[PDB]
């Protein structure tokens, strides 16, 4: 088989920086008709691929000029000129000459940007679910930069651990920041044992902790 | 410009599993039709193609003995076909062609028995207001397999939507959050509906999000 | 439009 190598692995870039990635083959990729069948995909965050460049060089329609793709034989590079929000996801080569077809590894492209509080919002479980026995609590915390935040959750002041479950968003593709959620699951009488349910959360972007709570009863 | 590919699809040890890509707005016989499958840590691995201006067929040999591919130039549809499925065979499934890409079709390959989800609201209230907006949602629970499709509004609503990747419970079922935010004025006049999707049990709901008085 | 590019040769005919 014919390997493609990407580098680098991972671009760490802020808006305005220009960007390159490398694609190099372990043969030569020109084909007995002249042309060289190499392709370039960016697959954007939660989506399908799509495609941005073929023939080496020639640029998919709609996609924007700060695009370009070079190279010839074996050495092959895609350069952003001056990165936007919208250009992160992961970069991928395939060629198109040889059997199997194959493709790069990926290069995963990343936005750096100014640090973002989160804004923080939670929810007492719904009479319908505390019917069936369950009570579930969430604490959102939207649209905050690095990525890196400490959720925890506290119950009439006590620190929780091992009832909770965080998922976080993929960066979003205009402000280039993060979500997350985190869900505290109790059973129905564990839940009705307790008064003040907190969630209190840690982040570079705020000056000291910020607290969310409710009481069992007001809401 | 456009491949649309068919829905997901839980599937047996053993079994096979055929699914479909239909193509528009280019000429579905003048381009390689073809099947990629991509692993769960971002590699893209080729099936094969087709090409369908005259049926013939190339195979990367890995999969030469469980993939079937086929083309119906009537309808533009492509059609894969992977018999004798293991685990290794959960995956997305995408087809490409030309400038263009389907959205995938996730296959499980799980002797589990389908479960569709439970749908309970996220009820914005005053504690879940920040400068002047609300936060809302639906918390989606309890399904297998993968996955459901949350949309608000019939799909009329998609602005400030994060629709989270779903966990994986201890049970071994999922549960995701969608949640929006809105102005914190408009909760007496709008009204915010989440609608569930969840195709390998033919589960739909919708759920409308009411605000909570606290 | 003009029609977008191939990502490899289509195959010959077979017979």
Known sequence: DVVMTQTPLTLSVTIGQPASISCKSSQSLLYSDGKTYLNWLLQRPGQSPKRLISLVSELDSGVPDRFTGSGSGTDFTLKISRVEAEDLGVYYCWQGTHFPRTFGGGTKLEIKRTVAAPSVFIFPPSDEQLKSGTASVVCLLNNFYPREAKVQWKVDNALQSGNSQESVTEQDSKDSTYSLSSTLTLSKADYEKHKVYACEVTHQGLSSPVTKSFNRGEC | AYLQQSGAELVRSGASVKMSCKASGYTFTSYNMHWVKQTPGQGLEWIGYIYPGNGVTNFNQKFKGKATLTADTSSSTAYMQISSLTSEDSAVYFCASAAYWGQGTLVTVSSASTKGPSVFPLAPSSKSTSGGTAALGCLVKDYFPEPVTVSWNSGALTSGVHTFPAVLQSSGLYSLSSVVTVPSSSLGTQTYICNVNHKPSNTKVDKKVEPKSC | ?15
């Open chain 3, 1 to 15: 439009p003009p029609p977008p590019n191939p990502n490899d040769p289509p195959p010959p005919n077979p017979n």
